[PDB]
Amino acid sequence: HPETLVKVKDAEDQLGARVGYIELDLNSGKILESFRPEERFPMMSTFKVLLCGAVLSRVDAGQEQLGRRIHYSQNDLVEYSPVTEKHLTDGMTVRELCSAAITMSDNTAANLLLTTIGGPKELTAFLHNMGDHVTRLDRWEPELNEAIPNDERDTTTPAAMATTLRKLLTGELLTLASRQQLIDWMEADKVAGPLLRSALPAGWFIADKSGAGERGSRGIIAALGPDGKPSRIVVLYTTGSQATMDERNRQIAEIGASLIKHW
Ligand SMILES: [Xe]
Ligand SMILES: [Xe]
Ligand SMILES: [Xe]
Ligand SMILES: [Xe]
Numbered sequence: 001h002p003e004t005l006v007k008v009k010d011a012e013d014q015l016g017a018r019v020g021y022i023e024l025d026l027n028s029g030k031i032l033e034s035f036r037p038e039e040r041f042p043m044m045s046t047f048k049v050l051l052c053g054a055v056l057s058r059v060d061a062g063q064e065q066l067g068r069r070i071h072y073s074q075n076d077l078v079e080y081s082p083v084t085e086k087h088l089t090d091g092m093t094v095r096e097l098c099s100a101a102i103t104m105s106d107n108t109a110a111n112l113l114l115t116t117i118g119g120p121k122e123l124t125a126f127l128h129n130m131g132d133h134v135t136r137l138d139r140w141e142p143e144l145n146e147a148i149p150n151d152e153r154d155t156t157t158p159a160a161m162a163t164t165l166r167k168l169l170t171g172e173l174l175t176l177a178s179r180q181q182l183i184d185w186m187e188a189d190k191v192a193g194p195l196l197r198s199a200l201p202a203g204w205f206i207a208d209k210s211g212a213g214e215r216g217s218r219g220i221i222a223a224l225g226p227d228g229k230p231s232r233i234v235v236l237y238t239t240g241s242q243a244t245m246d247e248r249n250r251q252i253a254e255i256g257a258s259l260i261k262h263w
Contacts, residue, residue: 001262044211145213199256216241
């Protein structure tokens with residue numbers, strides 16, 4: 001809806017920073033709304049969904065097993081690792097790592113998962129081979145959040161990430177079990193409270209993943225819909241702003257409210 005587009009435009013001027021927006025019809029892939037859809041934004045933690053997509057593809061192929069246990073050391077723990085810092089002795093299964101990476105945005109979890117697939121370049125190769133020749137991961141946590149202006153490292157575009165998320169969740173790539181697992185992790189997201197979820201009426205479904213990084217970067221990817229079933233994909237990024245986290249949150253929440261009101 002155009003008034004949602006207005007909220008996006010106003011957010012861009014008010015934050016003094018680029019904002020990218022895509023609204024995708026989940027069933028048909030038809031685009032309902034878009035703003036700067038072919039511009040690059042740092043992915044930040046929204047990449048962790050793509051990461052566990054790659055992991056799940058290896059599970060399907062039998063190259064990985066969800067119950068395989070990984071041990072690591074204290075030296076592996078980078079900033080913000082709320083789950084992995086609790087399992088230095090017992091270790092964590094691959095399933096637990098993806099749960100940590102997506103639901104809690106655990107950074108060390110993401111790094112360990114990256115190692116299982118061969119690093120950022122191999123995540124990019126995975127994306128490439130599923131039809132996304134735009135999105136690229138280059139670095140690890142936390143350096144991938146640097147958000148240097150016009151840097152293309154660790155970026156996606158509104159349109160590329162929307163289509164890739166749609167393919168991961170509903171496309172032929174993953175098995176039904178793996179699609180369901182992925183969406184289940186995103187539905188269990190615990191660190192995107194004040195964003196799209198804030199605009200959500202009771203009874204609605206949402207599966208999402210948010211991100212924040214340097215230089216005012218903020219973003220969220222989501223599959224959502226009324227009556228407990230998702231029907232749209234929404235991708236929203238911004239970078240460059242000097243705004244507080246709280247205002248960036250509120251701007252996203254306001255776009256979300258428009259999205260709902262004009263659903
Ligand atoms: Xe979905
Ligand atoms: Xe935003
Ligand atoms: Xe929303
Ligand atoms: Xe949003």
